[PDB]
Design a protein around this ligand. Structure first.
Ligand SMILES: CCCCCCCCCC(=O)CSCCNC(=O)CCNC(=O)[C@H](O)C(C)(C)COP(=O)(O)OP(=O)(O)OC[C@H]1O[C@H](n2cnc3c(N)ncnc32)[C@@H](O)[C@H]1OP(=O)(O)O
Ligand SMILES: CCCCCCCCCC(=O)CSCCNC(=O)CCNC(=O)[C@H](O)C(C)(C)COP(=O)(O)OP(=O)(O)OC[C@H]1O[C@H](n2cnc3c(N)ncnc32)[C@@H](O)[C@H]1OP(=O)(O)O
Ligand SMILES: CCCCCCCCCC(=O)CSCCNC(=O)CCNC(=O)[C@H](O)C(C)(C)COP(=O)(O)OP(=O)(O)OC[C@H]1O[C@H](n2cnc3c(N)ncnc32)[C@@H](O)[C@H]1OP(=O)(O)O
Ligand SMILES: CCCCCCCCCC(=O)CSCCNC(=O)CCNC(=O)[C@H](O)C(C)(C)COP(=O)(O)OP(=O)(O)OC[C@H]1O[C@H](n2cnc3c(N)ncnc32)[C@@H](O)[C@H]1OP(=O)(O)O
Ligand SMILES: [Cl-]
Lengths: 136, 136
């Protein structure tokens, strides 16, 4: 178990209300001992002009999940902030919801590296991303 | 000029309606002989829960401008898709609109690389990104 904070999915989902996370219907759905998972619809708010998932929406999902996960691995007054992000778009998505799964690559005292894989509804990899955070 | 397609700012903004670009009020505002620019509000649709611009929103902006620029540099039946995107978030934004400025780093026959820098309303760098596209 990597977490230092014990926060439920309901509290996480409550925080998204009234901001970008809520606007895109990103929903946190599972917390493992070393994973965090959220889904996002492929719809008008997340689509390119001709119906495929906007690659930027996948990054919004990746950065949201990676930041939350990083924060959960700090304690007390500590905050995390994303410094760098990269993403590889390997497959497109068109319908249903995509699902982001975030795992740690490195949990440091000063920075973290997170990997987020985004899968379509059939479980195929669509986007693979790395987020580097600073702990402040 | 680097462009091979002639597609006006009016037409671009029209095409964003009903999809992610339109829902975030991203607006294409300038096309130079070798640059392309668009702006985006910092508001509830693009903010983190505690009020700052969501880092994923900047990447939506970057990927949108880069992908369009890349398309405008091809011809005929050619398509352009983003392959890899990366970004450093160097400064936060909290109000007004941010502006993305996109310039080519490489215009090839099979792939392209675009640099997109996003600035707050005062002209200060907030996000520096690179997009690699594939020409299909
Ligand atoms: C379902 C709901 C769940 C919720 C989901 C939401 C997910 C969130 C979304 C995602 O965007 C998460 S996040 C992903 C996106 N990432 C970004 O947007 C990061 C942008 N980059 C930077 O800001 C700087 O380069 C760094 C501070 C990084 C560098 O550190 P540095 O060595 O360069 O420090 P520096 O000398 O520059 O500045 C020092 C201080 O100045 C800043 N400051 C001053 N005044 C204010 C103020 N009024 N309000 C706020 N901040 C203010 C402070 O940050 C503070 O920084 P530090 O204490 O760290 O020293
Ligand atoms: C306001 C005005 C307008 C609005 C502005 C907003 C713009 C936003 C745009 C932004 O979202 C950027 S864009 C959004 C972010 N980017 C992405 O989402 C891209 C995801 N990545 C991929 O699809 C693949 O890696 C590649 C196809 C890249 C390579 O292939 P690869 O080296 O991985 O080899 P692989 O075999 O694994 O893949 C097979 C593929 O070949 C087929 N195929 C599809 N199209 C073409 C074509 N044109 N030409 C030829 N073939 C095409 C596909 O069906 C596809 O999958 P299948 O196995 O079922 O055959
Ligand atoms: C002039 C011309 C020619 C020469 C120029 C050419 C130069 C080339 C440049 C070169 O390639 C660049 S350089 C080459 C390439 N880059 C690299 O090699 C960097 C590799 N990365 C790291 O070291 C870590 O991730 C960070 C330290 C970054 C963060 O740490 P992190 O927290 O995120 O990760 P982590 O938690 O694992 O370690 C934390 C540490 O904090 C603690 N602690 C804190 N203060 C002190 C203290 N005063 N004294 C003692 N300890 C101190 C340490 O105990 C240690 O904790 P642990 O042991 O329990 O884990
Ligand atoms: C788990 C336990 C936690 C809860 C404990 C209980 C707390 C007590 C109360 C209880 O009800 C629950 S606690 C609550 C439950 N929810 C949650 O907990 C979830 C999280 N909530 C959020 O993220 C927010 O929606 C934001 C802060 C991002 C909105 O920020 P935001 O409201 O500032 O979004 P905004 O769209 O406004 O941004 C930009 C701007 O638009 C405005 N503007 C410009 N022109 C006009 C005009 N003509 N007319 C109107 N507005 C105009 C300016 O305000 C301007 O602000 P800036 O100056 O910044 O640009
Ligand atoms: Cl295209």
């Amino acid at each position: 178990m990597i977490w230092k904070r014990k926060i439920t999915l309901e509290a996480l989902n409550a925080m998204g209300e009234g901001n970008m996370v809520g606007f895109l219907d990103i929903r946190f759905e599972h917390i493992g001992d070393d994973t965090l998972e959220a889904t996002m619809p492929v719809d008008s708010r997340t689509k390119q002009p001709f119906g495929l998932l906007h690659g930027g929406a996948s990054v919004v999902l990746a950065e949201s999940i990676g930041s939350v996960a990083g924060y959960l691995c700090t304690e007390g007054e500590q905050k995390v902030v994303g410094l760098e992000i990269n993403a590889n778009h390997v497959r497109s998505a068109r319908e249903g919801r995509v699902r982001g799964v975030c795992k740690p690559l490195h949990l440091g005292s000063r920075h973290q590296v997170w990997q987020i894989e985004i899968f379509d509804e059939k479980g195929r990899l669509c986007c693979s991303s790395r987020l580097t955070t600073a702990i402040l």
